[PDB]
Symmetry: C3
Subunit: 449 residues, 3 copies
């Protein structure tokens, strides 16, 4: 643990360090067979209510089978790469001539085995439920008669339970237009998922890390509905394969830092655009700009790599002071003055401007601070409430240290009355070049006159 | 009621007035206990089908319990303040030493009571269902034998109903990774929600306003899964606490206003960026830029305050004419000419340009209007259809007045051939300063030459 | 079929042609009645468990009825036109005096008929389920007594099934606050949907195209819960009415194209902002900028027209070379250098810059290509994996041709050290005018000195 956090007032940003990493790098496919049984028609016209119930359940089964048969900041630097592609290839291979027959003929004695398709591939296959014996040898031979009669009541319960399970599966396929995410409990039982993870050919540390957080690995999985033929139903489940384990993985937070003045409209200032998760992998650091693309869960930062960047390992240099001519980190200059507040993982940062009232609070002492102009930092050491203007925020509650590096705002260094403004992706060097060009132009203009 | 609407052609904007307000300002927590019963193993190996069904349902119950055990415009001026924080604190307090034991020992005679945790806090607690008696003195003493036999059939139905309820609850926890929104009917019944609202320590007007719109208050609630131990399951439900009631709360709508010309490419014009809900609270007006953050429901504008602003009470000054040097409201200058149409709460605004065909229609008179160049307003007084180019829109149908303030477009005031363009957050003063600087520069250049 | 694709290296873009089109243009409404039966109270206090189960199910029914009674790039050029408007009008007409009584009195002998409301309108009406005979003729006359007793067990199963269906409907209305999308299997079964489609007053080709893709037409539908009165429940289902069929409909894809250099920071370049679906309709082409607004399904591009443009039919002129002074297509000039990759429908485009490593791969030959600086195109003819930096992408697998039009990047034509940059919607003419103005200004400055 030991989640540390630092706040830098030179740029008015916050960094949170201590989180471990778990980065996915590859997909994995598996075939699930739910083999059905062929039913054609019913002929018996009995009077007893049990026959009517069984016939109604069989009609619901047939309707479900027919329906399933008929079913067959800095954000614009990511890429539109497709998500589900391996499952599509697996389903296309399954659609080929006779491969499903080979799979069915290779799974007659054991419910779990390893089957090889055409070309070259190794995919796990798993069989669920059983409908080739109960409905073929027990109910089918008697219904196709003239005087059917069922002298029992538990068979109805069992049949409706199995039909309810299958109908739930087919309705889940029906509603979501053939693609579902995440996989529900109906599609994959917990024990079956554990068996699949155990049998999946990876190392031991990855198995240990993935088997203790089945919720996360279920959240990021996928399902593809596949060919229906030869009395057997098979679909494809796609499970992520985590590739980067136990590396330092920190977080960044930004907030506007503007100078205060009595004159309205002269509030040029600076802001950062490096939100999201920085993280370490290989030799070049990753980058997740969207904070909603992945979720922190139990001191871990499980995150996809499809929407990520490839920044050099020297990006961790402007977090101390944005002066070094080694790497610039995307200033967000503007000319707006609005109060705001952000709640980082351990503390709170309040940028309070103008005449708006901004105060911290407590559960037993009421008002405890009187935040002045500019941006300030309050730590989780006795406060549980921050009010800004006429809106209220709650502060997170955890255990950790809270440092405070004093400094001086950098906006005061910049001279007003000459300032570019309205740059969405200013990178320090660009704004400095613009300032130098403007100064040279005005100097030449006054010298020549 | 009396939903009035006005259209200003000077800037081509629409204002809708008459809506009452309901602004949330604080959260509230409650603890729900669904206490289970401990089951270890089954030994009887009877042959009767009822025993098999009961054993299967008990196995499903145990698997569910084990799985739950293992489970434990202007948009970038809002703030990233956390949503669920009070529930986290309540769960953390519950996780402390022996508090759950105190809660369980204080809820042995009455199903509803008030319990106080450590430090200082007052949280309501509620008990649902009953599984400490049915499964402990009826099924457990007889299953743990050698010759179990159940000579009844309704017990199976009752047990399957209770197990279905509990398994639905645990599956809905399982699928959504431990956080659900909004709370489903399974988690909180109508009677329990009404009892909690009645017992909530608030005034009478808030209770009257919230008890008649239970759908809205259910939509904005939250649920957190909490500690499992000592044969009792408890989780946290978070219900919003509305704080601002019965204040004027109007709506704004914008549309591009551009001049027409025969020459292609010379279509510099102006647009607004004040979409969303203006509203009144305290002494400084609020602001919700996103129109999808909250929903209008039955002449009310229920809206969260986490994503909101703190604009001064003088913002209602550029809605008449954007000339007064008191407050600027964020021009959106551009150099694009595309036709568009917007459907406000009572009428339609169509900005029709170029050679595209744009016409209103009716259900009994066909074509009724022949909208010319520029932006025009059509009211719901005989029209129910607007076609622009090759796309179709339906107009809302309500009852209210429709005014029309004639004026003159303000783009004609601006002189072309010198115009900044490509400013995302121009604020009238900035564009005027740019124009003045350009005019001064060109004047000096021609004077010195 | 024959999905062809071309890649133009002049601007580094990709075009995919061959897809057929299916464009929606209008809505349609239908009334569904689920007529209930009135129940007031229960008086019999029998001891048998069957009476208890029936009473509990009746109480659940009453609670559900009471709950339902109480329930009574280039993205900012689209428009905020309302989605559900026809259903609102239909419900408002239904709410008028006595129309529901007329509908109920006109549907006493046949379950399907055509009824006309006030003013003028023609809406289909449909009746589902039956609760005016089972519960009012069998259970009500015997429960309202002193010594009720039910000597059967199948009635419980039938009643629980019907009550489960009705409670599922009312719960799904309850959770989603009165508006649901898409319609689940509960509100509309397969046979009823097929009957409604067959009875829909449209041509034959549209019926043939829509009856084979019921998933898509169900995905884009809507459901509005409507007036409750006179012991009859009615709601409105809104089904799309496709209007444009069998027209050419192609797709465009873009990727940054930048020059390479050893000096860091001097990497001015150009990018396109014409993502989404171009498509043909009438005489003016449509435009869908968002790629997530509609889904490709089985060689068809079903897409709503609510969020679309009205571009002239001459837009298909800058796809060959952006030089012709006929139409400009929105350059996205910038000054950033980041590697990226995009996976089009048949191939992959990789823009590889700097020191990052970018390689294609294969399942039987390992590394197969060594992509150099700039942007390159790889086709699906032996590759199934693309790695860029430290991230991995899979390539789509289909059948089709892959052309390659060689050329020269246009950014080499532009002379550096004088270049506007930071224009979000540059349109070739604008950047050329800026360049000409800057050149004229500097020429005058050096001539006068």
């Amino acid at each position: 643990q030991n989640i540390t956090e630092e706040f830098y007032q030179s740029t008015c940003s916050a960094v949170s360090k201590g989180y471990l990493s778990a980065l996915r790098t590859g997909w994995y496919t598996s075939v699930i067979t739910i083999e059905l049984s062929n039913i054609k028609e019913n002929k018996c016209n009995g009077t007893d209510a049990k026959v009517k119930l069984i016939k109604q359940e069989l009609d619901k089964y047939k309707n479900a089978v027919t329906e399933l048969q008929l079913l067959m900041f800095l954000g614009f630097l990511l890429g539109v790469g497709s998500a589900i592609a391996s499952g599509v290839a697996v389903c296309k291979v399954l659609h080929l001539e006779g491969e499903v027959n080979k799979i069915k003929s290779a799974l007659l004695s054991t419910n779990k085995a390893v089957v090889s398709l055409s070309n070259g591939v190794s995919v796990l296959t798993f069989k669920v439920l059983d409908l080739k014996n109960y409905i073929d040898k027990q109910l089918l031979p008697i219904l196709n008669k003239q005087s059917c009669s069922i002298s029992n009541i538990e068979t109805v319960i069992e049949f409706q339970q199995k039909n309810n399970r299958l109908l739930e599966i087919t309705r889940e396929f029906s509603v979501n237009a053939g693609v579902t995410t995440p996989v529900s409990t109906y599609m994959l039982t917990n024990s079956e998922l554990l068996s699949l993870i155990n049998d999946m050919p990876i190392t031991n540390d990855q198995k240990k890390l993935m088997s203790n957080n089945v919720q996360i690995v279920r959240q990021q999985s996928y399902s593809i509905m596949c060919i229906i033929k030869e009395e057997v139903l098979a679909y494809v489940v796609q499970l992520p394969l985590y590739g980067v384990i136990d590396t330092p993985c920190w977080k960044l937070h930004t907030s506007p830092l503007c100078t205060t003045n009595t004159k309205e409209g002269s509030n040029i200032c600076l802001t950062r655009t490096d939100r999201g998760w920085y993280c370490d992998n290989a030799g070049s650091v990753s980058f997740f700009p969207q904070a909603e693309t992945c979720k922190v869960q139990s001191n871990r930062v499980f995150c996809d790599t499809m929407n990520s960047l490839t920044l050099p390992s020297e990006v961790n240099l402007c977090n101390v002071d944005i002066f070094n001519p080694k790497y610039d980190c995307k200033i967000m200059t503007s000319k707006t003055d609005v109060s705001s507040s952000v709640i980082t993982s351990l503390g709170a940062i309040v940028s309070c401007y103008g005449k708006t009232k901004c105060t911290a609070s407590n559960k037993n002492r009421g008002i405890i601070k009187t935040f002045s102009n500019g941006c300030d930092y309050v730590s989780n050491k006795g406060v549980d409430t921050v009010s800004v203007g006429n809106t209220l925020y709650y502060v997170n509650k955890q255990e950790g240290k809270s440092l405070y590096v004093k400094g001086e705002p950098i906006i005061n260094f910049y001279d007003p009355l000459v300032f570019p403004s309205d740059e969405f992706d200013a990178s320090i060097s660009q704004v400095n070049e613009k300032i130098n060009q403007s100064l040279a132009f005005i100097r030449k203009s006054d010298e020549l006159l």
